[PDB]
């Protein structure tokens, strides 16, 4: 039950990725889901080959073009950044035979002696899934920054709680007395599909807080403009399920050193004594290590299967250069 077929092993490694649409004209006409899912198959396969000693991806051209066409700009852009090269021929060559299309991928030659300088990550990745918090912005760390982070984070080894969150309740419309900053983040509640919204924001914001030196707090239920405490109406959510969902998405966050020192508190939003709804605050201590929003977004062939890299594996491989 996978979109990849592994046809042969080393040293004639071949990954059949099924059908893909080629050509810039044909790919703009595609729907978003067709264009993105096809690009995923190409990137995931190319990354697997790069980290596994070379190979060729096998592709059945889905376009019915009378003549050969260019690969496509979006596919071109992905293979370029994945290999950190402005040129595609540094690692890729293409051939057209029958109704199949082959992309030969040179092995990612990290353990080499070159004059390249710059920065060569030991392993190829689509995303490090490592987010850090800077000011009021949360940023995805690239290979250069994540390596130095992971290395300098623990070649060598400030959290102050906000007393505003110790109250038994909040009043509807009350103005939050402190501003968004390095240690606090405000987000409104979605009008519909509460827990789906919460589960989408928790991994990135919480992971970025833990990876800083001082940690921070996430406060959900605050209007973005007026900074007034609104929360979600009690009719739209159950506060029991909300507290559990937030704790669960946090516990699922991949960790590399131990858990994250965090706490989730549910606050009742009152209106003249009557329960209107709930706000939520998540306080996270600084973690002596790295906390990921997801697994690291990279793959490699292990024995006879394309399997994603475990977090411990990706980190160990990354900083063994």
- Per-residue DSSP letters for 220-279? ESB-TTT-BB--EETTT--HHHHHHHHHHHHHTS-EE-----EEEEEEEEEETTEEEEEE
- Residue 187 annotated in active site: yes
* 19 vs 63: CA distance, rounded Å: 9
Q: What b/e readout covers 186-223, taking b as 16+ CB neighbours within 10 angstroms? A: bbebbeeebbebbeebbbbbbbbbbbbeebbbbbbbbb
Give the C-alpha separation, 48 to 70, whole Å: 23
Instruction: Return d(Cα 159, Cα 287) in angstroms, integer.
Output: 11
Task: Assess whether 104 and 26 both reside in one domain.
Answer: yes
Same domain for 283 and 136: yes
**Cβ(15)–Cβ(102) under 8 Å?**
no
Q: Which listed residue (106, 154, 187, 285) is catalytic? A: 187
Number of structural domains the chain divides into: 2
Omega cis (within 30) before 11? yes
Residue 207: closest CA among 265, 162, 146:
146
The span from the CA of 217 to the CA of 210, in Å, is: 10
Method used experimentally:
X-ray
**Residue 50: C-alpha distances to residues 43, 44, 121, 308 (Å):** 10, 10, 12, 13
Task: Report CA-CA distances (Å) from 205 to 131, 235, 293, 318.
Answer: 8, 26, 8, 24
Q: Are 102 and 10 within one domain?
A: yes
Q: What is the largest CA-CA distance in the chain?
A: 75
Q: Are 102 and 49 in contact (CB under 8 A)?
A: no
> In angstroms, rounded to a whole number, what is the distance separating the alpha carbons of residues 180 and 187?
10
Q: What's the rounded Cα separation, in Å, for the pair 159 and 260?
A: 13
* In a shared domain, residues 151 and 117: no
Task: Measure the CA–CA gap between 96 and 101, rounded to whole angstroms.
Answer: 5
Residues 116 and 171 grouped into a single domain: no
Tokens of 228: 């007034």
**Burial class of residue 316 in the structure, from the number of CB atoms within 10 Å of its CB (0-12 exposed, 13-18 middle, 19+ buried):** middle
Contact at 8 Å (CB) between 212 and 182?
Answer: yes
Assess whether 115 and 198 both reside in one domain.
no
CA-to-CA distance for 233 and 40, rounded, in angstroms? Answer: 39
Domain around 80? 5-123+300-318
Q: Which of 82, 89, 19 is nearest to 49 (CA)?
A: 82
Cα separations in angstroms, 231 against 178, 189, 282: 17, 6, 14
DSSP H helical segments within the chain, as ranges?
24-29, 32-50, 73-82, 143-153, 194-210, 239-251, 311-318
Nearest 5°: the CA angle 13, 15, 17 is 165
φ, ψ of residue 134 in degrees (nearest 5): -130, 115
Are 102 and 28 part of one and the same domain? yes
The sign one gets for the Cα dihedral 62, 66, 68, 72 is negative
Whether residues 258 and 169 fall in one domain: yes
Across-strand partners of 186? 219
Tokens coding 242: 């909300």
Token output for 176 = 């939050």
Residue 237 in contact with residue 279, Cβ under 8 Å? no
Length of the chain: 321
- Residue 280 vs residues 169, 203, 239, 286, 295: alpha-carbon distances, Å: 11, 15, 9, 20, 26
- The kind and range of the H/E element at 92 are strand 92-97
Asked if 287 and 247 sit in the same domain, the reply is yes
Query: How many CB atoms neighbour CB 174 within 10 A?
Result: 13
Instruction: Please check whether residues 192 and 161 belong to one and the same domain.
Output: yes
Do 111 and 223 lie in one domain? The reply is no
| Residue 200 phi, psi (nearest 5) | -85, -25
> Is the C-alpha dihedral spanning 294, 298, 304, 305 positive or negative?
positive
Same domain? For 287 and 309 the reply is no
Residue 165, classed as helix, strand or coil, is: helix
Cα separation, 14 vs 5, whole angstroms: 8
């Amino acid at each position: 039950d996978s979109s990849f077929m592994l046809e042969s092993s080393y040293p004639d490694l071949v990954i059949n990725i099924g059908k893909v649409t080629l050509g810039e004209g044909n790919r703009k006409k595609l729907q978003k889901f067709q264009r993105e899912e096809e690009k995923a198959k190409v990137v995931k396969a190319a990354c697997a080959l790069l980290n596994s000693g070379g190979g060729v991806i096998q592709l059945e051209m889905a376009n019915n073009d009378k003549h050969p066409v260019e690969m496509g700009l979006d596919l071109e852009e992905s293979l370029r950044t994945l290999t950190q090269s402005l040129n595609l021929e540094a690692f890729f060559k293409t051939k057209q035979e029958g109704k199949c299309y082959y992309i030969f991928v040179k092995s990612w030659s990290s353990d080499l002696f070159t004059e390249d300088s710059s920065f060569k990550p030991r392993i190829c990745s689509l995303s490090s899934s490592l987010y850090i918090r800077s000011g009021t912005s949360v940023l995805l760390m690239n290979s250069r920054d994540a390596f130095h982070f992971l290395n300098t984070r623990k070649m060598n080894a400030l959290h102050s709680p906000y007393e505003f969150f110790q109250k038994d309740h909040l009043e509807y419309g009350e103005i939050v007395p402190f501003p968004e900053s390095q240690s606090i983040e405000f987000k409104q509640f979605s009008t519909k599909r509460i827990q789906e919204y919460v589960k989408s924001i928790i991994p990135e914001y919480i992971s970025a807080f833990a990876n800083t030196e001082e940690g921070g707090s996430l406060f959900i239920g605050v209007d973005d403009k007026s900074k007034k405490v609104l929360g979600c109406a009690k009719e739209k959510v159950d506060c029991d399920s909300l507290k559990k969902t937030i704790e669960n998405a946090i516990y699922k966050l991949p960790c590399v050193h131990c858990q994250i020192d965090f706490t989730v508190k549910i606050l009742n939003v009152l209106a003249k004594g009557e329960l209107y709804g709930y706000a939520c605050v998540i306080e996270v201590k600084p973690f002596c290590g790295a906390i990921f929003s997801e697994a690291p977004r990279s793959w490699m062939v292990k024995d006879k299967l394309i399997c994603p890299l475990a977090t411990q594996d990706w980190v160990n491989m990354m900083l063994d250069t």
